[PDB]
Amino acid sequence: AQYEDGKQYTTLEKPVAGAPQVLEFFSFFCPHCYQFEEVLHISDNVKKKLPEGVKMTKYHVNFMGGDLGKDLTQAWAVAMALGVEDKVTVPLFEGVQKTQTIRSASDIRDVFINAGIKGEEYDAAWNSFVVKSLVAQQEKAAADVQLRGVPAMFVNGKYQLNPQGMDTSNMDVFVQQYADTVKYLSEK
């Protein structure tokens, strides 16, 4: 009774078939997601503790930030397609929430250019159907679980992380609790 359904995690009443093993959702507009990623480094510490053969997937969502939110989901598709997530995640979060210099799709593009992604490369990707397919994949995944809040993490389409059942007096402890819970669920 150390881990229990309803505490560190909840159980999906409609389990999602064929879902990624560990699926994280976020928005660059999401203040708690900024904390999760830039301050707590949740994705990294979770990934760091996944069993061998367990892949981690991270998807952007549309339902925050209106038009720009949709642009960001497309830009994240570009980031995934090019494999430059580790290059643009920080400046995208800071551009939206710290400096608030990201106000348009062009501003988003500037972040990729500054990170060394060539203009032609970004634009071809941005306009590609491979990227359209990746946008659709992100939307479908979020749709599969009736997603309406971020940050969120799901394990095997069956369990949903519940950070509200964790102590926050110490950041590092919270993070390891979160990561050990994901590991526990992935072995479940």
Ligand SMILES: CNCc1cccc(-c2ccsc2)c1
């Ligand atoms: C959805 N936000 C979850 C959460 C739960 C507990 C602590 C935090 C936190 C602690 C320092 S920054 C953000 C976030």
